[PDB]
């Protein structure tokens, strides 16, 4: 009820770095602002890892088999992640800016393109325990003149070639005794060689440069070595390459041009399959599978991802998020639905497990600000600075009726009665609470009495009276029913905003400018008690701040407050790095949460590093966009004083760490907050962290573990084999004294398998008590996994309660029958 852990980050589908699929084409790895998201395409689910990076990610790969994940910052922070286990194994620091990490197809060793250096390291072992210094640098190849921009292995591990912004594209081996076999360099291009490749046969070499050129290198005659047999030019006129991949087993080039165009070729032939305009915005990364039938693009001009097939004209996902523009967030009464609004207008509909915008609504023209659900999560509304509140349903996914005012006025916040007629909106301009009927587009009442803006509004779940927040430091509670049209002010003394009611509707959380949240009675007028937030808020000092965070007034209030589903807790969130969980009656915060730990995010750090405070100025506040190799990144369009305006590049600043919208789940007390980075999910759904067991097996290994007394691990080694002789060996082998010791430590992966094995075998078995202890220990062990996914165990549990009643409770009814006949026949008397 207190312990909330990070579960999943949603959206902002690409910022910076390399995109990769796994061994299988299911798992797609993308960078987020500092995290890695994994999108599984067929089993449509999304995931983002529990950790974050310290700067923006500029390099990424995963293992051959999907065991290790390497994320590397812009600076060269490297993070070793147990990819199957989602836990961080090692933080190494590469001291140079690297651009490419690629594992071996062997999986034995990976390599790194940092500067003009190639660093080739051995892989750390996953089944081995975590060590202090796991990484062993095998070799370092520094035969390059400028920064090495692209890098590949062969399909054998024994050949690696890298390419730089220097003209060179150079092959070596892993091992130096394989140096003499092939160790040479390629030149003769015009420009940045942006990608050089082996073919699927290791005899043809493809080298692609920025100018639009490919050479077909081949170890051929006029001993004799390595001529160009042909060149290939796509003849892009002013456009030039940004990114290039090559799928070798089908001989396919994916190109990304500066003009947002992209081409496909068949490389011994060099024949144009199709040209797609991905957009105005260039492909910043291309990717193929080992199957080579999906392609993955990312535009870091927009922040979009695109999985599209080359052979069939068909996308998989065309996802386009919006940074700094996650305005509203909305839990449904159902715990399966989530609504995110935006300043661009898009209002997306997410599942919490499968993190996909299932729906969107791109019909608002301006910023959408406040969204509440009503009537069992059927209808869902959207007040806007677009001058309207547009209604939305979750069955037809359509606009119902765009409630309008007179003078086309923007609307600050939205409140919906559960009785689905009454929708109130407060305005940032007009400061009159407009009440719309849902059935009639006319306004029901123009509630007047706000001097300065109406900040926020909510109704009770109980009496459905509304509480609006002035900027005149004064709550106005309106009771519009019983034909009174009656009002009451509550004077606060400092400037309130972000109002939030208890579900009982007799107490209200208020956030003043002091940070002090107050709780107000509604059946009476006085203040109940007030909890302080100006002390326990993590605020950040910007690099351009000229005052320390201890006496900074940047973010020590709260831009959103929410009551818990008992009404006994509150999660509040503001323009800070800090999200807070106060207890309502005990009146002291339970836990304080970071939203994001990113140096490029501005107000993350409490204390700035004094090595960056130079003579006159920061060390980072110097304009470094003027040194980019590309003209477009050297172009500055930043208008000076734009605060949360349209695009990212036009702040002329780092993005502030701010969290706009905060809500609780009804069911499992999970709270989600749409941040600057995107929607974050904290939950109490603990042990959804997926945990592989006993990773590489014989039947002898589990049976030797029976001889080795390693009985839970022997059960795992049996259940990976799935032969019922072994399961009845290992099942009756463990003693009773460690049955609940075993069953609480069973993963959820074999949970329907073990529940079905118990549910089937125990029906015909004499070990009724022994099976019964297993079902007791399992249902007391991990019944919560059957609380969430009921249809997952529905076949197994059916057999289980077949065994409980027909097989076991028949024996019990026999027992109680003979018992009660004993009690009668020994407690009563005779005759004669």
């Amino acid at each position: 009820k207190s312990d909330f852990k990070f579960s999943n980050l949603l959206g902002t589908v690409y910022r910076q770095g390399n995109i990769t699929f796994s061994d299988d084409g299911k798992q797609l790895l993308s960078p987020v602002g500092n995290r890695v998201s994994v999108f599984d395409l067929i089993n449509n689910k999304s995931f983002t890892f529990e950790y974050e990076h310290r700067k923006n990610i500029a390099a990424i790969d995963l293992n051959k088999q999907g065991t290790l994940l390497i994320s590397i910052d812009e600076d060269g922070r490297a993070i070793l992640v147990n990819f199957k286990a989602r836990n961080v194994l090692h933080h190494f620091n590469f001291k140079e800016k690297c651009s490419a990490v690629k594992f071996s197809p062997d999986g034995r060793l990976f390599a790194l393109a940092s500067g003009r250096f190639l660093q080739i390291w051995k892989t750390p072992d996953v089944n081995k325990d975590r060590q202090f210094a796991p990484f062993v640098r095998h070799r370092v190849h520094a035969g390059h003149f400028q920064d090495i921009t692209s890098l590949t292995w062969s399909q054998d591990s024994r050949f690696i070639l890298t390419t730089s912004k220097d003209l060179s594209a150079k092959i070596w081996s892993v091992d130096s005794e394989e140096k003499n076999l092939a160790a040479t360099t390629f030149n003769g291009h015009r420009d940045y060689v942006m990608g050089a490749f082996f073919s699927h046969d290791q005899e043809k070499i493809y080298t692609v440069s920025k100018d639009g050129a490919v050479f077909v290198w081949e170890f051929t005659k006029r001993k004799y070595s390595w001529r160009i047999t042909k060149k290939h030019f796509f003849y892009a006129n002013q456009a030039k390459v940004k990114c290039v991949t090559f799928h070798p087993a089908t001989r396919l080039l994916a190109v990304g041009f500066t003009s947002g165009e992209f081409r496909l070729y068949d490389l011994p032939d060099f024949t144009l399959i199709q040209q797609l305009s991905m957009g105005q915005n260039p492909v910043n990364t291309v990717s193929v599978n080992q199957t080579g039938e999906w392609l993955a693009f990312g535009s870091s001009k927009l922040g979009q991802l695109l999985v599209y097939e080359w052979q069939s004209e068909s996308y998989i996902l065309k996802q386009q998020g919006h940074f700094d523009s996650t305005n509203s967030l909305a839990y449904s009464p159902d715990g399966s639905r989530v609504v995110t609004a935006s300043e661009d207008g898009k209002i997306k509909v997410w599942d919490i497990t499968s993190g996909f915008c299932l729906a969107t609504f791109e019909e608002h023209t301006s910023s959408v600000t406040a969204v509440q659900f009503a009537k069992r999560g059927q209808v869902m509304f959207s007040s806007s600075l677009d001058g309207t509140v547009r209604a939305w349903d979750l069955i037809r996914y359509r606009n119902f009726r765009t409630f309008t005012g007179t003078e086309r006025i923007q609307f600050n916040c939205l409140a919906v009665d559960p009785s689905g007629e009454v929708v109130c909106a407060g305005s940032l301009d007009n400061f009159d609470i407009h009440v719309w009927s849902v059935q009639t587009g006319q306004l029901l009442d123009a509630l007047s009495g706000h001097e300065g803006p109406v900040s926020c509004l909510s109704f009770s779940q109980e009496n459905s009276v509304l509480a609006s927040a002035s900027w005149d430091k004064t709550i106005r509670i309106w009771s519009i029913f019983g034909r009174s049209q009656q009002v009451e002010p509550i004077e606060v003394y400092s400037d309130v905003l972000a109002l939030s009611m208890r579900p009982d509707g007799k107490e209200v959380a208020v956030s003043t400018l002091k940070g002090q949240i107050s709780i107000f009675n509604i059946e009476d007028a006085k203040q109940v008690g007030n909890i302080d937030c100006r002390k326990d808020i993590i605020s950040g000092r910007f690099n351009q701040d000229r005052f320390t965070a201890k006496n900074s007034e940047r973010s020590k209030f709260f831009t959103t407050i929410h009551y818990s589903f008992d009404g006994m807790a509150i999660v509040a969130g503001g323009n800070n790095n800090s999200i807070c969980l106060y207890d309502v009656p005990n009146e002291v915060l339970l836990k304080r949460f970071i939203v994001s730990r990113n140096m490029a995010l501005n107000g993350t750090l409490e204390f700035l590093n004094s090595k960056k405070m130079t003579e006159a100025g920061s060390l980072d506040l110097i304009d470094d966009a003027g040194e980019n190799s590309d003209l477009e990144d050297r172009i500055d369009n930043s208008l000076p004083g734009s605060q949360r305006g349209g695009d990212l590049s036009t702040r002329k600043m780092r993005p502030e760490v701010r969290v706009t919208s905060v809500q609780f789940s009804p069911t499992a007390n999970a709270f989600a907050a749409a941040s600057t980075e995107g929607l974050l999910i904290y939950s109490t759904n603990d042990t959804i962290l997926f945990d592989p067991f006993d990773l590489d097996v014989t039947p002898h290994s589990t049976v030797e573990a029976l001889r080795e007394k390693q009985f839970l691990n022997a059960l795992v080694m049996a259940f990976r084999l799935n032969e019922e002789y072994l399961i009845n060996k290992v099942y009756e082998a463990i003693p009773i004294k460690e049955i609940p010791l075993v069953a609480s430590n069973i993963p959820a992966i074999y949970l329907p398998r073990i529940l079905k094995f118990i549910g089937d075998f125990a029906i015909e078995s004499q070990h009724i008590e022994f099976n019964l202890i297993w079902i007791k220990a399992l249902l007391s062990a991990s019944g919560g996994y059957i609380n969430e996914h009921k249809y997952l165990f529905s076949t197994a549990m059916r057999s289980i309660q077949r065994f409980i009643v027909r097989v076991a409770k028949e024996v019990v009814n026999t027992t109680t029958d003979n018992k009660y006949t004993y009690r009668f026949l020994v407690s009563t008397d005779g005759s004669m």
């Binding site: 009724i768 409770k809 019990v812 027992t815």
Partner: protein, 812 residues
């Protein structure tokens, strides 16, 4: 001895130990290789950043350290490690059982001496090769040649000449041949330290007297001498920077600096290293730089520089004294109490009998910084009480820290030795803060903990009073009196509502914190030595003198679990991050690990050392032990966060072909089982040689023969078998068959069937027993039926429980 849940990662918090460290160069720059027991460390000299650690703990402690350019040569017991980058590339195990004393590197050779007064020679397999792997020979020093081998050095421009110095004299060898090319005469003092020289031919020797001898070999003569009054020399070094300067390191901690041209000492440093821990253990000028790196046995490694000379006209005469430069220190004594400071497992507080805190950083070994003990100028104005010879704070027995309001006031409370109060410290300012918190009943502070709101520190006296001081102004709030013995562990709940305390009276007191009432008072058996609380899950654990940790629920106001199982005084113990486990360590050299939902010791680590403090990280990753010897903090990776391990009760015992399997009939005798085959027999039955065999089982008063064919009797024939029971007066075959059934349920197999036979008795002779109710013969056997019968409600307690849980879990 091996752990399954945790594993050793490194011993955090150590810089050196006193073993003479080695210096090396990469190109222009310098690295330093020091020893910590069985694990060596490498440093840049220009920042004292940690560069490498050993890939393995060595099986015995490293005795010697030498270092060439990329290869660091460690020397433990019989074997010598050739390490590149802290990784064992080549172990050279010497062909004695004598212990390796000293070591040196020159040419294509390696030379290492043992304590059998014999040096071993190890050639490179080629000059093309880089590390020496070929075993050349063993030469020795017999007691006409020299004494006990103090050092092996190679003075430069000496072709294959090995300079072996003893307590007596100096020898020179051709290690290609193996011939003693020269023996020096005895110096009359006991030679203790050698050092080569940037001049030719000279070896400097610092003896057991305060005497340093410059000694030639081309002369064979002791060219100059240098005296020291009443100090035992430990290290010698030469400043090769550009003025001829000599470094004399005592074992009294003092460092003496000479200029041999002016024939004068320059400055003597006093007490740069602790005298009791070996004095100055090794000091060495970095070659061609005015920087001397000193290393003490107080887990400390300092740097000093000569400033360039102020005299423009002179230079060499006017010398600035050496000046403090960067240093990595550790706890000189072993650490008494540790804790995990932050939430993200970045910092650990470690307090020792060195009388100091240290704020170690498990992220980066250089952010590890010693805390200040500098009092704020007292807010009253009247002056404070203490000696003007300001001593360190007395060593600490308890620690307390909450990072809720960090850096707005103090948030570290430390219970010093034999002080009536306990000081407060800012974690952020790395310095003891303004308030000190008293007992106000004139007893010692014996346990402290702080409020999670960061506003209260709780202080438990040796006379029982618990004071609640405020972290705002240092003011007290309430002084609770429950215990008349000592308090020994305090806590608050995570909501700051209900506070617990454990005492040396055997009382755990439940008080409210918002309210002021004593809510509950649980009396445990032995007095209660410590208290650990889990804020996320509202439990609290305690060690008592009954060698066993009781975990007490704070809601249900009673014991939830007690782990018996230890063998001695339980030193430290800790919950998990999530309350699933408790790590305990006791004086029994065991560190056991407990799964509290069940309550079984699921692994215990046997250690060579006694583990004093264990500390589970708030993150689910790290376990910190501190031992009784050893000054660092053993960090342990938690494998459960990575894959898993087994959870068995296996501690006290230490401390196929046909791919098919027939079922076991009965696993243990205590469990109940049914009849092999059809379950439908109950549904059938419920919807003479026989009586002779029943008699022959009755005369045994064991009826195990009857039950066999009783299962195997055809179900319709039993409808005449029980309907002929021969009992009108004696009721024998009634009592014979009923006791046959009760002996049938005794082995618990075919449990349902004897119930069916009992109900078939009621179908057959319920009137024959009923009209003769009160008869003490059949009533005895039915009393025996109830006594055997009353255990098996445990499956009715299983079936109803498991059924309701199944329905409740499917529906909700």
């Amino acid at each position: 001895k091996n752990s399954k849940i945790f594993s050793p990662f490194r011993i955090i918090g150590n810089v050196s130990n006193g073993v003479p460290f080695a210096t090396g160069t990469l190109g222009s720059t310098f690295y330093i290789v020091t020893c910590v027991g069985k694990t060596f460390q490498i440093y840049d000299a220009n920042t004292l950043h940690l560069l490498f650690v050993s890939e393995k703990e060595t099986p015995s402690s490293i005795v010697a350290l030498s270092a060439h350019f990329h290869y660091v040569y460690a020397a433990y017991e019989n074997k010598v490690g050739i390490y590149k980058r802290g990784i064992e590339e080549h172990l050279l195990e010497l062909e004695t059982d004598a212990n390796v004393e000293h070591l040196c590197i020159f040419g294509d050779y390696l030379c290492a001496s043992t304590d059998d007064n014999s040096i071993f020679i190890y050639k490179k397999s080629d000059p093309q090769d880089k590390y020496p792997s070929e075993f050349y020979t063993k030469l020795t020093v017999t007691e006409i040649q020299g004494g006990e081998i103090v050092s092996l050095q190679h003075l430069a421009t000496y072709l294959n000449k090995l300079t072996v110095v003893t307590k007596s004299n100096v020898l020179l060898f051709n290690v290609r041949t193996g011939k003693l090319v020269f023996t020096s005469n005895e110096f009359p003092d006991q030679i203790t330290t050698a050092e080569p020289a940037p001049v030719l031919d000279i070896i400097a020797l610092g003896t057991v007297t305060g005497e340093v001898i410059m000694f030639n070999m081309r002369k064979g003569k002791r060219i100059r001498t240098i005296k020291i009054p009443q100090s035992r020399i430990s290290s010698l070094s030469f400043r090769t920077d550009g003025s001829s300067h000599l470094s004399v390191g005592t074992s009294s901690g003092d460092l003496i600096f000479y200029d041999l041209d002016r024939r004068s000492r320059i400055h003597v440093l006093k007490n740069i290293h602790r005298e009791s821990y070996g004095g100055v253990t090794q000091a060495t000028f970095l070659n061609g730089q005015p920087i001397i790196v000193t290393s003490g046995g107080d887990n400390s490694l300092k740097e000093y520089v000569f400033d360039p000379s102020l005299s423009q006209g002179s230079g060499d005469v006017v010398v600035q004294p050496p000046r403090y430069l960067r240093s990595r220190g550790g706890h000189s004594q072993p650490p008494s109490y540790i804790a995990f400071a932050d939430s993200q497992s970045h910092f650990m507080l470690s307090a020792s009998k060195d009388r100091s805190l240290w704020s170690f950083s498990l992220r980066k070994d250089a952010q590890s910084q010693e805390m200040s003990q500098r009092l704020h100028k007292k807010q009253d104005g009247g002056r404070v009480g203490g000696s003007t010879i300001k001593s360190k704070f007395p060593e600490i027995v308890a620690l307390a820290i909450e990072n809720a309001r960090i850096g707005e006031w103090e948030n570290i409370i430390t219970a010093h030795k034999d002080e009536k109060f306990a000081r407060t410290w800012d974690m952020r300012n790395k310095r003891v803060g303004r308030w000190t918190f008293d007992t106000t009943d004139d007893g010692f502070v014996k346990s402290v903990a702080m409020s999670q709101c960061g506003n209260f520190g709780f202080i438990g006296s040796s006379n029982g009073s618990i004071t609640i001081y405020n972290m705002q102004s240092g003011i007290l709030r309430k002084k609770y009196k429950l215990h008349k013995r000592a308090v020994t562990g305090i806590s608050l709940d995570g909501m700051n509502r209900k506070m617990v305390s454990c005492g040396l009276d055997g009382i755990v007191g439940f008080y409210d914190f918002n309210k002021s009432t004593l809510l509950g008072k649980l009396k445990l058996d032995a007095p209660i030595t410590a208290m650990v609380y889990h804020r996320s899950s509202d439990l609290f654990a305690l060690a008592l003198d009954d060698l066993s940790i009781v975990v007490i629920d704070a809601v249900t106001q009673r014991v939830v679990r007690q782990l018996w199982g230890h063998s001695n005084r339980i030193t430290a113990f800790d919950f998990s991050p999530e309350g699933r486990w408790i790590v305990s360590a006791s004086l029994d050299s065991t560190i056991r690990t407990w799964d509290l939902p069940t309550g079984g010791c699921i692994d215990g680590i046997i250690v060579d050392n006694v583990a004093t403090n264990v500390k589970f990280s708030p993150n689910g990753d790290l376990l910190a032990t501190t031992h009784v010897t050893g000054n660092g903090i053993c960090i342990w990776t938690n494998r459960a966060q990575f894959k898993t391990v087994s959870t068995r009760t296996i501690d006290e015992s230490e401390f196929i072909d046909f791919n098919t399997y027939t079922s076991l009939e009965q696993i243990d005798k205590e469990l109940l089982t049914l009849s092999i085959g059809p379950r439908s027999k109950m549904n059938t039955l419920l919807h003479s040689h026989f009586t002779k065999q029943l008699r022959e089982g009755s005369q045994s008063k064991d009826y195990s023969s009857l039950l066999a064919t009783l299962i195997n009797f055809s179900p319709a024939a039993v409808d005449l078998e029980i309907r002929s029971l021969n009992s009108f007066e004696p009721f024998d075959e009634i009592v014979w068959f009923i006791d046959a059934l009760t002996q049938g349920l005794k082995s618990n197999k075919n449990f349902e069937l004897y119930e069916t036979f009992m109900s078939l008795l009621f179908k057959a002779h319920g009137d024959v027993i009923h009209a003769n109710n009160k008869n003490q013969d059949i009533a005895s056997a039915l009393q025996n039926w109830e006594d055997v019968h009353k255990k098996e409600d445990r499956l009715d307690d299983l079936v109803k429980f498991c059924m309701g849980v199944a329905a409740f879990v499917t529906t909700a």
